[PDB]
Amino acid sequence: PQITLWQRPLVTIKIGGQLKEALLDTGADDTVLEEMSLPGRWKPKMIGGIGGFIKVRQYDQILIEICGHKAIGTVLVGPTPVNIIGRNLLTQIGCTLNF
Amino acid sequence: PQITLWQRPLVTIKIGGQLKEALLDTGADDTVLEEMSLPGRWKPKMIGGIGGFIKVRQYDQILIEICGHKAIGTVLVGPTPVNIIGRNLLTQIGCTLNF
Ligand SMILES: CC(C)[C@H](NC(=O)OCc1ccccc1)C(=O)N[C@@H](Cc1ccccc1)P(=O)(O)[C@H](Cc1ccccc1)NC(=O)[C@@H](NC(=O)OCc1ccccc1)C(C)C
Numbered sequence: 001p002q003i004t005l006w007q008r009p010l011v012t013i014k015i016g017g018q019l020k021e022a023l024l025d026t027g028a029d030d031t032v033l034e035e036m037s038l039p040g041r042w043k044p045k046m047i048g049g050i051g052g053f054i055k056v057r058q059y060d061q062i063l064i065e066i067c068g069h070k071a072i073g074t075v076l077v078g079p080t081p082v083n084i085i086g087r088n089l090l091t092q093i094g095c096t097l098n099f
Numbered sequence: 100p101q102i103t104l105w106q107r108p109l110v111t112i113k114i115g116g117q118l119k120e121a122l123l124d125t126g127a128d129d130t131v132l133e134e135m136s137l138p139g140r141w142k143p144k145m146i147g148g149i150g151g152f153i154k155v156r157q158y159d160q161i162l163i164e165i166c167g168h169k170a171i172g173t174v175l176v177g178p179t180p181v182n183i184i185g186r187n188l189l190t191q192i193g194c195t196l197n198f
Contacts, residue, residue, distance in 0.1 A: 003138035003196040005186040009125050013193070024196050025126030026108050027183060049132070050179055051151025069198070080149055082127060087104040090198075097102040097123055099168070 001067070013085065014065040015075070017095060020083050022066070026097055028086030031064075032056060032076040054078050069093040100166065101197075105106040110166040112184065114174070119182055122166075125196055127185030130163075131155060131175045144175060153178050 003009045009024040016038045022031075032048060036089035042057035056078030063072045066085055102108050104170035108123040115137045118180055129146060131153075141156035145198030162171050 003197065005125060005190045005194060005196070008128075008186075009196050018110050023126050026104060026125070026196075027122050027124035027126045029107070031159070047149065048180075049150050050146065050153050054105045056166055067198070073176035081147070082126075087107075093198050095104060095196060095198040097100060097125070097194060098197050099102075099123075099167070099189075099192050 011067045011085075013067075013083070015062065022083035022085045024066075024090065024095070025084050025086055026090070028072055029088065030076050030086045031073065031078045031084060031089050033087070034080060035077055036073070038062065038077060039091040042077070047076060047078075054080070064089065066093050068093045105137045110157060110184070112163040112182070113164070114161065121150055121182035121184050123189065123194065124185055125161060126154060126188065127183045128187065129175055129185040130172065130183060131179045131185070132182040134176060137161065137174070141176070146175060146177075163188060165192055 010021045013022045043061045045058040056076035060074040062075040071089050073089045109120050112119045131152045143153050144157040151168040161174040170188045172188045
């Protein structure tokens with residue numbers, strides 16, 4: 001699609017058997033999701049944004065279908081008030097910003 | 100411009116007599132720029148991101164020439180590490196997410 005930004009760029013994602021809406025984000029290097037029960041081993045890692053830093057669980061090689069497009073990447077899980085799809089996955093579904 | 104996301108989407112902006120480089124961000128509702136010198140009255144505002152809540156000086160009606168396109172809007176100035184061009188100006192330069 002072509003998503004104008006008059007409203008938050010939200011899309012449906014399917015990850016670990018669950019359905020969630022996530023923000024398409026060019027200002028996020030990483031994908032960070034709300035806490036869910038995602039199966040597997042996870043290294044600790046910490047990220048920053050405004051306000052500070054949060055501790056997240058790094059899950060790597062997770063498959064996630066963003067708008068029907070599938071991708072596999074690292075997904076950080078942690079206390080975030082919105083789920084975020086960052087550039088590490090946005091490049092796999094072929095996403096470009098245009099103006 | 101068509102901008103792929105392998106690299107951070109940074110574009111140059113000319114704001115208040117000064118040259119800056121900022122992040123084109125579809126995950127920011129607002130525009131938040133590094134603490135800088137800008138003329139005007141401001142009102143305190145507070146924004147939230149991950150990790151927490153920063154207090155910022157809110158400015159309305161500031162002209163920003165983003166990637167050599169002009170636009171006028173509210174600009175927040177405060178303790179960020181990267182300047183962000185959020186959706187309140189991204190829609191003025193006509194920007195779209197495309198996949
Ligand atoms: C999502 C994270 C993976 C991403 N962080 C990240 O990429 O870290 C890079 C970094 C940081 C520090 C040092 C070194 C490197 C991140 O925090 N990105 C924000 C922009 C940014 C900040 C710091 C460094 C680089 C870039 P963002 O993607 O624009 C973030 C997305 C988001 C997170 C949480 C909640 C909502 C939305 N927006 C924001 O934080 C804006 N907040 C915002 O739009 O919503 C207000 C809100 C909504 C809901 C609840 C509470 C508050 C803010 C710029 C005003």
